Amino acid sequence: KWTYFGPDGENSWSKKYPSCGGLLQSPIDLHSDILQYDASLTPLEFQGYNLSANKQFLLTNNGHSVKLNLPSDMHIQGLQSRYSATQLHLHWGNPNDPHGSEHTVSGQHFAAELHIVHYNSDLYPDASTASNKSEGLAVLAVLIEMGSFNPSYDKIFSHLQHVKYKGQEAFVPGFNIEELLPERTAEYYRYRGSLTTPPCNPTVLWTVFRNPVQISQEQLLALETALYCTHMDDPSPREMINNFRQVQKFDERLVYTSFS
Amino acid sequence: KWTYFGPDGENSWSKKYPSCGGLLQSPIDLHSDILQYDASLTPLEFQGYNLSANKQFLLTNNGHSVKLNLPSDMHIQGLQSRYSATQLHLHWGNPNDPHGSEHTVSGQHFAAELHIVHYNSDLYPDASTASNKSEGLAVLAVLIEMGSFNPSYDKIFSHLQHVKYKGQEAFVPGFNIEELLPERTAEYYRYRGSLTTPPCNPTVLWTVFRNPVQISQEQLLALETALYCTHMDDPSPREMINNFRQVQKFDERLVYTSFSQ
Ligand SMILES: COC(=O)c1cc(S(N)(=O)=O)c(Cl)cc1S(=O)(=O)c1ccccc1
Ligand SMILES: COC(=O)c1cc(S(N)(=O)=O)c(Cl)cc1S(=O)(=O)c1ccccc1
Ligand SMILES: [Zn+2]
């Protein structure tokens, strides 16, 4: 019902998802002129991120990213409500232009970006119900650049080949999701914005960590090449690449920073 | 009708203008991974750009773009057909954020951008007809940075008050349009793209000069406060600001450079 390329790509999302042409759209360029230090931005606490080695979590290719389902006892402490985990997923570019983060910093893309989606569980029963509702969602965003090999990210990437096609799923044994976060998580950008995918609801409190993580060149290439958007049996396969949204105008608004 | 801000802004243009959601869209970010040197990109020659100072050229505000109309004797030599001029116009930001170029370079906006629109007059009678055909249009794009006062650009900016509102027109005396071009015009980026406004037809052969020109802070402020999208008598005035489109996905394209380095 939507893609990142061709006639169903992001300029057309607004036809069937009207919020994608509304206010508060993400992502955005985090550039120096709109940043404002805010002392009220205290460190978040990541509760229940150490997932039971004994539990298994569903990894799915639904056609737009790959998603790892997360349990609802996993949550962020430190916001105005408790926000419980629902899933994580990534965005990336392609081997010929490996710069596929959604947020940019001073106009520069990172190689990729991880999102850990949470919903307001003090108010709503599930992310679905939260997603179109006031204060419904909070996302943690990690920027990713090419560098040293990252064993923790491999705990997800080593499963990519089982979810190559739309509809495929694999079980992933629990691990400590906090290993996916960067150094100095107390340092972050914060703004009110939207889902970066349809239906683009303006209901997301964004936290983009200041510091990127690194993954190896081989890991990045595997991410960029492992997946397709199409079913195994589609005679016209489409690679899952460039699954990021272009930055949105962000006018007469600030991004708050927990650092100066 | 379409705008750069709010419910009728650029993520909604495709609802009325289908090409805005199709292939070959402009503008784009120019960055190393998609550039390729092409030694066949030889210099353009600018013919009949020195418009007589004793003649007059119509400037118009249609609510979307203020355009200086140009005579069809003005043309580019060097492309695969003669491309004759039709109009030039600008894109810019706003007083509190003078960063409104359409093309970006390595992720950064310039202060503004000049587009000099031409059409294939060997094949077509007018730009409107041309605008529906592959490579029917060629635009020269000049990136504009805040810097020194520019007397040549002032030959346009000094007239905007007579066209402050939609539906207004005024006459500008001829001057040498080549004065608006940067240094070393032989160095440019070339790619296949589209109109950056509705109806977004993918029918433009873009030439973006490598080097910017400078206009001053004061000239930027004047341009960002001079003009309205709306009629003089409209009870809901809208300033003509931030009239640039976000860069578009590349869709496998490369940009060809006439410079190697
Ligand atoms: C299709 O949706 C996604 O891909 C997505 C992506 C984002 S994202 N990329 O902004 O973090 C969020 Cl917050 C949440 C989700 S989502 O939780 O998957 C979702 C899906 C349908 C309706 C509501 C929410
Ligand atoms: C509404 O159009 C413009 O504003 C515009 C803008 C561009 S641009 N801003 O891509 O140079 C060109 Cl090439 C050409 C034009 S245009 O020549 O004005 C035009 C208008 C309607 C249909 C076809 C062409
Ligand atoms: Zn233009």
Author numbering:
A (entry chain A): 3 to 262
B (entry chain B): 3 to 263
Would you copy out the relevant sentences from the publication that reported this structure?
The carbonic anhydrase (CA) family (CA, EC 4.2.1.1), consisting of twelve catalytically active human isozymes, performs the catalysis of reversible hydration of CO2 into bicarbonate and acid protons. Since it has been observed that CAIX isozyme is highly overexpressed in numerous cancers, it has been postulated that compounds inhibiting CAIX may possess the anticancer activity and may be used in tumor treatment. Here we have designed a series of compounds, methyl 5-sulfamoyl-benzoates, which bear a primary sulfonamide group, a well-known marker of CA inhibitors, and determined their affinities for all twelve CA isozymes.
The same binding mode of 9a in CAII and CAXII could be explained by the same interactions between the compound and conservative residues of these active sites. On the other hand, the binding affinity for CAXII differed from CAII by a factor of 26 (Kd_intr = 0.020 nM or ΔGintr = −63.1 kJ/mol for CAII vs. Kd_intr = 0.51 nM or ΔGintr = −55.2 kJ/mol for CAXII). For this reason, the binding of this compound to CAII was 26-fold stronger than for CAXII. Like the previous pair, these compounds differ only by their meta- groups: compound EA3-2o contains -NH(CH2)2OH, while 9a contains -OCH3. Their orientation was defined by the bulky SO2 group of the linker, which was in contact with the protein surface.
